[PDB]
Amino acid sequence: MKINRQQYAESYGPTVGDEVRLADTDLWIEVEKDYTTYGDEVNFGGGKVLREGMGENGTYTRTENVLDLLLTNALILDYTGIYKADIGVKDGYIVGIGKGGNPDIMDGVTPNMIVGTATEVIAAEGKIVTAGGIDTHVHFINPDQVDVALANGITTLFGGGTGPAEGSKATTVTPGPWNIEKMLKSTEGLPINVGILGKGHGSSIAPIMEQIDAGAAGLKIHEDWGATPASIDRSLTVADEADVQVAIHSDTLNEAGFLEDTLRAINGRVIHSFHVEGAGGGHAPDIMAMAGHPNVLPSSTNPTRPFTVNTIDEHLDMLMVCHHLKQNIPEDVAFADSRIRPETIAAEDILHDLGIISMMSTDALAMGRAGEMVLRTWQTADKMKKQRGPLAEEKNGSDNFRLKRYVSKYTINPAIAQGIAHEVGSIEEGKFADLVLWEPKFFGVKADRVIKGGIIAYAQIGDPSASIPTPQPVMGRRMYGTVGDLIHDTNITFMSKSSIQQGVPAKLGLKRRIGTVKNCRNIGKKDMKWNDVTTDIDINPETYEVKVDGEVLTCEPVKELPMAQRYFLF
Amino acid sequence: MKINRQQYAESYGPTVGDEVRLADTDLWIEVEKDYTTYGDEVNFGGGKVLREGMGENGTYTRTENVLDLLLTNALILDYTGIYKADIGVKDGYIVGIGKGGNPDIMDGVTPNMIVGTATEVIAAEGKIVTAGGIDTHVHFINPDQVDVALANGITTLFGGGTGPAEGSKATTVTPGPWNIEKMLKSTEGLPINVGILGKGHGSSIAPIMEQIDAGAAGLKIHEDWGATPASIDRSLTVADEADVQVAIHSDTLNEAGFLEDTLRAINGRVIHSFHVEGAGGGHAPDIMAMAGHPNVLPSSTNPTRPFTVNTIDEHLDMLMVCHHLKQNIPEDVAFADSRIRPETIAAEDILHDLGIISMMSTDALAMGRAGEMVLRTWQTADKMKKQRGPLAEEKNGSDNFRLKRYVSKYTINPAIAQGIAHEVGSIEEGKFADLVLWEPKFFGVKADRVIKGGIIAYAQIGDPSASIPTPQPVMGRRMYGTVGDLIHDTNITFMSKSSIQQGVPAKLGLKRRIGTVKNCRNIGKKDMKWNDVTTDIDINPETYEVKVDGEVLTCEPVKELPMAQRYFLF
Amino acid sequence: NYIVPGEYRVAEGEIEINAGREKTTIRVSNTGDRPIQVGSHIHFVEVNKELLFDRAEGIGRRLNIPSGTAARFEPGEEMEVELTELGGNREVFGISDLTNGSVDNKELILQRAKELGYKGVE
Amino acid sequence: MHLNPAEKEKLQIFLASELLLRRKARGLKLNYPEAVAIITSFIMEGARDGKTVAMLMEEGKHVLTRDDVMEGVPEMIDDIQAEATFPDGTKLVTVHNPIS
Amino acid sequence: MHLNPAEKEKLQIFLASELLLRRKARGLKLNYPEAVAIITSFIMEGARDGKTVAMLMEEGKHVLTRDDVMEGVPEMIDDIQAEATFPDGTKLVTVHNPIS
Amino acid sequence: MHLNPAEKEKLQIFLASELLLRRKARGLKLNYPEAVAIITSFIMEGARDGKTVAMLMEEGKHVLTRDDVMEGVPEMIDDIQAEATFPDGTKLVTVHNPIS
Ligand code: NI
Ligand code: NI
Ligand code: NI
Ligand code: NI
Ligand SMILES: [O-]
Ligand SMILES: [O-]
């Protein structure tokens, strides 16, 4: 008996060689391999395979190679591959990627992926499954930002802030031991993973270090607190001792130095350069040259992503509004013109496509959109395909190389930068079960279901009074993973090694899972998956033209994007 | 001095012999007796009776026969009677039904119903008060379902699920020790009583039993997991050891057996047959014959309740949608036609009226409506009165017999089936104070106030910014019983004896009241209050005609129901 | 170049299920008066007693149909079906409790089937 | 009013439909959520009018045509489901392939 | 806008009134929540117009008559209460027996 | 529909604008939240229409004039900001001193 491929794909999701369109983009991903045994696919329902004595084993207790949860027939999109597999989860972690079911009667069952009495099932046939997004540039300004992030598939928020205080509205900073303690306690009620950044400012070590000991997971150097050579130096000395990451928003004003002075202060130490293109902040006009260096982990923030016809007008005015700048003060106009540059924004598109900028992030509520990191990553990839063509690395027909390069920017790379990739950032055995299911038609736009620690936390679902869950209105809603004490077991608070050793979680009564930040100081650009390119980036101080390998990097802004007015009510 | 009965009823609620219409139905309930002493009625307000030295005693401390709460002048509708009384609550439990006030000066005061310094008052004059509804067929799919249930007077949810995972969207099952632990922790944030069902599937005892030890309160056998003779047998062996109830959704497909095979596997042991009519699932076409047997506790789910002109068209399509069935595949059409049957749906109305189906339930979000169990019970009773007449048992004029038969279906009977009637399910001294106040005009449609453990949890109330609580918009809202740690003291998590003995609540940090499931295995149809009839139900395999005592049970579908478009905005 | 969001572009060819496993065709009759529908992965010898077929030919086998589909027998209907071999360890537990171990134990399975009235033990 | 949770939620469908109808009236091709809102509100208002489930399954396929919506929207909408209070209580309507 | 909790809530009354007015316009006898919504929104808009509490107590009894609503609805509505911002601040209006 | 949190919230702006437009139509001078609602909804509908950010910065200054609003309202509104989905994705529009 044979099944035609159209009918197979409709029933079980796609298999090897089949392609799927990402939303309404021109991007096609192709199934590279498939772990199934044809005829023994797992599925659940009336008269289906996962029934006792059949695809469900009726013999084994939970400890005996049985799963807590099986996602059947997933199309995985990850830095590790684009492929078809069942995903097995146990104790909140991914324990198996392969083929689930019952070894009694099925061929090819992965030995620790037994469906048993203890096993829940999520049908992933016809869905794309990715890791949860890791947003490393979050300003904690308004708690309503969490659902916004979850709805676009983000599952970890790294950053700082105490709410809508000016320090926090400007900088990803929770300053000092007391504010840090308060925000660790607030975090107990946020249905998302969290890590908190302290203020990377001071000329003595102790005031900076005591934040790490209090429970910060990293530091932010920000020009609004003085991004001076001294603050840069002390923060990196702390970070090297503490094994945490430092993010920087550099001295746009060039007040205490130019880019080369900031690099001298860094002195070859590892650093995460936020909004590296510079519209979001940094040494005018040449900050983006940071992304060429081996010790720099470079990210973009999302409003420049990608370069469109409204980008400049929007940014010039956004900047003037936010800094209370006046159009009739020439220094204000000069500042704005030095900071918002089509030459560097256009080059930023291309640097992403080339693997020179390694990460995406939001800048949520400060100069960026909490629910558009994933969205804008794919809009960028689509624009680059249209303007630059398939990458040379592609094996005819598919966009798999580009898809792996771009998915890495908001999943594994930010996790590696922050020292948390042992726990999150990819679909790999041994990592926390933060997983996002997407219908291909909504891919990158609106998540179907967001799984946190192996329990659904957020879902697009309908009328709670209806006979079935699909009648209108279908909207994003918090699910049982967020309710009661389950919010503690399905989310991680990431903290410094020292705060954990000093018993801060017990002192504060933290009940969430505690994650350790580690292996942040011994990495570089080379460790950024699919985005590991170092090169000399030249930014002309007169024209702002960007050159790499002797060639000007330029492209046009687009008038329309996919993943836009077809989907959104406003 | 004498008061005319119209004026008496307006001031104090109705008294003996007075009748009240249930919503906009044709059903009339009559006050059977009244515990008051005329002239010494309790009431509260400016210049009213419950004042210090008067109807409120000023001498006694709380421990000394004083109540925490008195509901004054309640018209109780319960399996135990339809009668007028004050209701006294203390330590979260009903401690007195009788006459409240001050023995200093009033005649006829029940000795432990003293209104004292410690006593809060709820005015129930002109209200009907019932026990909270006990829904034993809940799929835990979307947390927004809890308020939907509370708004129609449901106070206990028994069932299973982990959110909108396919296993849970199909089956009332929280599978295995880990999912059960996670959902017990989630339950800490749900403002309603809860019991969790494990997966009633396996061929070895240990995988099933470990769910009971983990904290499950019962088991669900579901065809979607294999409702095989072996799974039926092992689940009942577990249940008999553990003293928990087993629910079944049987093998519709007749794959491993017909109804008689399922009954043989049951082997006379006690079982709760869900959606016994079978549109909601079970041996096609004859599952409803289960309701004749002495060891079967039979429930309906709500979308077939009652038989209306849109029922069939709605169900046929609902079934096709949910099973992804195609109208041009003859086996799919044959399946649907074998499962959705006007002959058995019409007979189901009558079997309710005769006391042969003992219980109602929702099937919330799987094939049933979370907020319509109570609603549809009364619509069924009203239809049956219109089509069959007053029951022979009625004492002229009133519908009290029918009202007690039907109120029992969603209050006491499900509580007895589940082993929880020592705690909930009726307005009786010694039981938990889960009470629902209804305005007669909204009876069965929208609850006025829902009391949980003696504190109001949910209420229809107006503008929170207004001078008084009655200005618009009046809508269902969570009250103080649901806030902070009070949610722990006003709700019960029901659990197996073994999990309680093994210290699961302490292990998981559960703060809710813990209820013990017990006395589930030594009951039968005979123990279903007002609904205790056993008989041979014949279902013709060719015509689907249902016969009891040699007579075909049939009735017509209705074009209109009460408790419908007069009340609902959508 | 009309865009259907999320559309597939499947490869050429067909998918062969249960490749390399022995196939067997047998006649099966629903002798009962109610419909019986049989899923792809039920041990075929353990189906409803009132299905009449050579029960020995169902041992260690299941329907050779796509995973998650079923064969339907209306009341009184007789038809041919194609079976394939079970895989993995070739053991069955539970279901109708006819096997509870290796499917190689044909005499024991048939003894149990016969005693319990599973039609077609020869 | 005594609004329950569903009544509160479903007001939003009516509102989204009103928004979408204004967009259509000024000449815009409608998008996915706009199209779904219009058809959903149509079903709920039809129930209020006292139509049958069968009538609405038919009518729901003629509310919007492909020229009313953006490219790909017809193929994005496999079905639209709504529950509303009919004269005979709450019922589910599913409109299959509403826009051809 | 600086919306406070009451301003957010009361938008829903206006919306429900708009829904109910459309139902009335196409010939339907109105139900309980529809009737309450129309009269409530009338009161709040009247306050906005600068009418007095006394004027609205009078006018509120003439917004809907028994022929506008289903059987039993007049007797279900004993009064309708609304607070709104008058020229002289927030005041409570109660319309007694609004539909005779 | 697949509504996200922002789509749900922004429905309320459209509704408040509809309310305010009805108030203006019956002759009332508009207040602060009414004025802000009308201009905000105008911006979001303009994005939906496919106008540019630059067009809306211009047009937003001509939606309401001082004779449309109460005393002091022009001076209370320093700017109005709205984000909406343009053909090229979400963008921020700020209308400076919208009412002269
Ligand atoms: Ni910055
Ligand atoms: Ni920032
Ligand atoms: Ni069921
Ligand atoms: Ni169910
Ligand atoms: O930033
Ligand atoms: O069910």
Tab-separated table of C-alpha atoms in Angstrom, chain A residues 44-48 50-52 54 56-63 67-69 89-92 115-124 449 453-456 459 461-470 477-486 489-490 511, chain B residues 140-146 148 162-171 173 175-179 182-183 185-186 188-190 199 201-204 206-208 210-211 223-226 228 230-231 253 255 303 318 321-322 363 365-370 508-509:
chain	number	residue	atom	x	y	z
A	44	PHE	CA	-4.043	10.357	18.943
A	45	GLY	CA	-7.853	10.277	18.850
A	46	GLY	CA	-10.858	8.023	18.354
A	47	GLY	CA	-9.706	4.846	16.621
A	48	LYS	CA	-6.141	6.189	16.319
A	50	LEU	CA	-1.988	5.814	20.679
A	51	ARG	CA	-4.322	3.415	22.475
A	52	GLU	CA	-3.565	0.786	25.147
A	54	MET	CA	-1.375	-0.621	20.470
A	56	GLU	CA	0.387	3.110	23.856
A	57	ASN	CA	2.230	0.675	26.089
A	58	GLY	CA	0.096	-0.655	28.981
A	59	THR	CA	2.906	-2.271	31.008
A	60	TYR	CA	5.480	0.331	32.054
A	61	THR	CA	5.372	2.689	34.996
A	62	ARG	CA	6.334	6.330	34.483
A	63	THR	CA	9.969	5.832	35.545
A	67	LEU	CA	7.094	10.140	28.669
A	68	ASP	CA	5.014	12.782	30.428
A	69	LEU	CA	4.225	14.351	27.039
A	89	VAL	CA	9.165	15.570	27.339
A	90	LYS	CA	9.631	14.369	30.923
A	91	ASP	CA	10.108	16.274	34.187
A	92	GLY	CA	9.702	19.499	32.202
A	115	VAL	CA	3.820	6.374	25.264
A	116	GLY	CA	2.360	4.937	28.447
A	117	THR	CA	-0.357	5.462	31.001
A	118	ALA	CA	1.531	8.593	32.200
A	119	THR	CA	1.717	10.269	28.756
A	120	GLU	CA	-0.187	13.356	27.543
A	121	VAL	CA	-0.308	13.994	23.773
A	122	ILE	CA	-0.063	17.174	21.714
A	123	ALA	CA	-0.670	16.700	17.992
A	124	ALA	CA	2.027	18.620	16.082
A	449	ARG	CA	0.446	27.189	21.656
A	453	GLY	CA	8.474	23.654	31.164
A	454	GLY	CA	6.286	21.023	29.519
A	455	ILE	CA	2.857	22.597	30.209
A	456	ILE	CA	0.991	24.924	27.849
A	459	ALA	CA	-2.670	29.590	23.491
A	461	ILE	CA	-8.131	29.548	21.663
A	462	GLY	CA	-11.798	30.392	21.495
A	463	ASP	CA	-15.028	30.764	23.439
A	464	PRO	CA	-14.638	29.259	26.955
A	465	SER	CA	-18.411	28.732	27.120
A	466	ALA	CA	-18.629	26.743	23.880
A	467	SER	CA	-19.073	23.014	23.268
A	468	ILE	CA	-15.547	22.853	21.762
A	469	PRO	CA	-12.615	25.352	22.014
A	470	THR	CA	-12.484	26.566	18.431
A	477	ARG	CA	-5.092	33.576	26.492
A	478	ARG	CA	-3.089	32.395	29.506
A	479	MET	CA	-3.436	28.661	30.121
A	480	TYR	CA	-3.088	26.421	33.199
A	481	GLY	CA	0.716	26.612	33.288
A	482	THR	CA	0.302	30.215	34.479
A	483	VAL	CA	-2.241	29.492	37.253
A	484	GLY	CA	-1.677	28.868	40.939
A	485	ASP	CA	1.662	27.399	41.952
A	486	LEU	CA	2.204	25.838	38.499
A	489	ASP	CA	7.455	24.931	38.040
A	490	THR	CA	7.002	26.031	34.441
A	511	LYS	CA	9.657	29.186	44.451
B	140	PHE	CA	-9.564	21.274	31.975
B	141	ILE	CA	-8.827	23.025	28.700
B	142	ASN	CA	-8.998	26.816	29.239
B	143	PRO	CA	-8.892	28.464	32.725
B	144	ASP	CA	-11.485	30.999	31.531
B	145	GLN	CA	-13.989	28.096	31.870
B	146	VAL	CA	-14.096	28.518	35.671
B	148	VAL	CA	-18.337	30.454	33.037
B	162	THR	CA	-3.560	19.828	31.279
B	163	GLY	CA	-4.868	22.666	29.092
B	164	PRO	CA	-5.383	22.596	25.323
B	165	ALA	CA	-3.341	19.498	24.623
B	166	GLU	CA	-5.090	17.020	22.322
B	167	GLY	CA	-5.315	14.343	25.032
B	168	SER	CA	-7.179	16.790	27.258
B	169	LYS	CA	-9.274	18.321	24.471
B	170	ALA	CA	-10.532	14.747	23.871
B	171	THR	CA	-10.558	13.136	27.351
B	173	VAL	CA	-7.623	12.790	31.847
B	175	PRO	CA	-2.128	11.413	32.870
B	176	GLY	CA	0.559	10.096	35.185
B	177	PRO	CA	2.126	11.261	38.406
B	178	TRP	CA	3.881	14.338	37.007
B	179	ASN	CA	0.964	15.842	35.085
B	182	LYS	CA	1.428	19.907	38.063
B	183	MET	CA	-2.372	20.233	37.870
B	185	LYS	CA	-0.421	22.943	41.893
B	186	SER	CA	-2.393	24.822	39.179
B	188	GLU	CA	-4.228	26.325	43.990
B	189	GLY	CA	-5.230	29.290	41.758
B	190	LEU	CA	-8.691	28.101	40.575
B	199	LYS	CA	-5.890	7.795	32.790
B	201	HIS	CA	-5.752	2.664	30.799
B	202	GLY	CA	-3.198	-0.072	31.085
B	203	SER	CA	-2.784	-3.844	31.249
B	204	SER	CA	-0.629	-3.791	34.407
B	206	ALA	CA	1.121	-0.254	38.733
B	207	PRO	CA	1.000	2.359	35.942
B	208	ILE	CA	-2.678	3.047	36.748
B	210	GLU	CA	0.598	5.285	40.738
B	211	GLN	CA	-1.767	8.026	39.512
B	223	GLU	CA	-12.132	5.076	23.864
B	224	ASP	CA	-9.507	7.532	22.553
B	225	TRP	CA	-6.944	5.768	24.811
B	226	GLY	CA	-8.406	2.279	24.100
B	228	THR	CA	-10.647	-2.234	25.860
B	230	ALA	CA	-8.268	-4.988	29.756
B	231	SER	CA	-8.238	-1.236	30.480
B	253	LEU	CA	-16.671	1.631	17.238
B	255	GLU	CA	-13.884	-2.615	17.938
B	303	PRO	CA	-25.684	19.460	24.375
B	318	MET	CA	-20.072	19.174	15.328
B	321	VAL	CA	-15.782	18.985	12.287
B	322	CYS	CA	-14.167	17.550	15.416
B	363	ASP	CA	-18.498	17.883	29.031
B	365	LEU	CA	-15.101	22.375	26.016
B	366	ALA	CA	-14.901	18.809	24.617
B	367	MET	CA	-18.532	18.292	23.596
B	368	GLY	CA	-20.447	20.380	26.128
B	369	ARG	CA	-21.010	23.767	27.616
B	370	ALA	CA	-19.325	24.747	30.904
B	508	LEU	CA	3.449	19.787	46.803
B	509	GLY	CA	2.841	22.725	49.157
